[PDB]
Design a protein around this motif. Sequence first.
Motif, PDB file in Angstrom:
ATOM      1  N   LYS A 146       0.807  -1.208   0.000  1.00  0.00           N
ATOM      2  CA  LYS A 146       0.000   0.000   0.000  1.00  0.00           C
ATOM      3  C   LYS A 146       0.845   1.266   0.000  1.00  0.00           C
ATOM      4  O   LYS A 146       2.047   1.241   0.292  1.00  0.00           O
ATOM      5  CB  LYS A 146      -0.992  -0.028   1.219  1.00  0.00           C
ATOM      6  N   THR A 189      -0.072   8.351  -0.044  1.00  0.00           N
ATOM      7  CA  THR A 189      -1.049   8.502  -1.160  1.00  0.00           C
ATOM      8  C   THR A 189      -2.005   7.306  -1.118  1.00  0.00           C
ATOM      9  O   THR A 189      -2.112   6.605  -2.140  1.00  0.00           O
ATOM     10  CB  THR A 189      -0.314   8.669  -2.496  1.00  0.00           C
ATOM     11  N   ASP A 190      -2.688   7.106   0.013  1.00  0.00           N
ATOM     12  CA  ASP A 190      -3.564   5.918   0.209  1.00  0.00           C
ATOM     13  C   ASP A 190      -4.721   5.875  -0.798  1.00  0.00           C
ATOM     14  O   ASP A 190      -5.265   4.777  -1.007  1.00  0.00           O
ATOM     15  CB  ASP A 190      -4.103   5.891   1.640  1.00  0.00           C
ATOM     16  N   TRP A 191      -5.097   7.021  -1.371  1.00  0.00           N
ATOM     17  CA  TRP A 191      -6.199   7.060  -2.372  1.00  0.00           C
ATOM     18  C   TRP A 191      -5.793   6.301  -3.642  1.00  0.00           C
ATOM     19  O   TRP A 191      -6.676   6.048  -4.478  1.00  0.00           O
ATOM     20  CB  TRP A 191      -6.606   8.507  -2.676  1.00  0.00           C
ATOM     21  N   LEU A 192      -4.512   5.943  -3.772  1.00  0.00           N
ATOM     22  CA  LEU A 192      -4.028   5.179  -4.935  1.00  0.00           C
ATOM     23  C   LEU A 192      -3.993   3.694  -4.644  1.00  0.00           C
ATOM     24  O   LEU A 192      -3.770   2.900  -5.555  1.00  0.00           O
ATOM     25  CB  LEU A 192      -2.640   5.683  -5.335  1.00  0.00           C
ATOM     26  N   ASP A 193      -4.278   3.243  -3.382  1.00  0.00           N
ATOM     27  CA  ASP A 193      -4.269   1.829  -3.063  1.00  0.00           C
ATOM     28  C   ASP A 193      -5.283   1.088  -3.883  1.00  0.00           C
ATOM     29  O   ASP A 193      -6.428   1.525  -4.027  1.00  0.00           O
ATOM     30  CB  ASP A 193      -4.633   1.630  -1.573  1.00  0.00           C
ATOM     31  N   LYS A 248      -5.222   0.721  -7.021  1.00  0.00           N
ATOM     32  CA  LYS A 248      -5.239   1.236  -8.380  1.00  0.00           C
ATOM     33  C   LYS A 248      -3.840   1.266  -8.974  1.00  0.00           C
ATOM     34  O   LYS A 248      -3.732   1.171 -10.205  1.00  0.00           O
ATOM     35  CB  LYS A 248      -5.825   2.634  -8.369  1.00  0.00           C
TER      36      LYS A 248
END
Length: 164
Positions: A90, A118-122, A124
Amino acid sequence: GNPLVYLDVDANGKPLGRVVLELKADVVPKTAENFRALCTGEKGFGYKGSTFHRVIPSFMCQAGDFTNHNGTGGKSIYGSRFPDENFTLKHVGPGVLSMANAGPNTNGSQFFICTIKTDWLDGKHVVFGHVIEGMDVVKKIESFGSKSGRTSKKIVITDCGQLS
Ligand SMILES: O=C(NCCc1ccc2c(c1)[C@H]1C[C@@H](N2)[C@H](O)CO1)C(=O)NC1CCCC1
């Protein structure tokens, strides 16, 4: 074990230093192997001489487009794109090394080094390693970016390779 690789980076032709990355071959072997080989140049192409073309302070430093030098290109050692291996790792914080993409199953050679979590990219983007040393060099690259991502100096990976 896992590969250790390096990037030596310049800003307008002057050295910023070395970034050392661990590649998590234990979790994402195909993704780690692509990056390792692009660092050595052993397939006949790779990151040497290419740029960090998009750098956003307080976010990430992006590089790897050695075919078009503008964010539209790059290619993998396997072909023009390869599948998302897994999303086990992650985006936990600064120093995460992750693949850029143009949607599911479009990994090539572009990548980014996070300067924040940048957890919103996990789930993806495939995370495949992290900075071992040279986070200060990543922060120097970051300082030459802008909110638009355009860099104020030409940031070039002058050399790269494998340490172990
Ligand atoms: O900028 C980003 N992505 C778009 C550019 C892109 C990335 C990979 C690839 C391609 C294009 C080309 C070549 C190859 N691989 C595939 O064939 C698909 O087309 C991107 O994810 N930024 C990251 C930085 C933080 C947020 C996400």
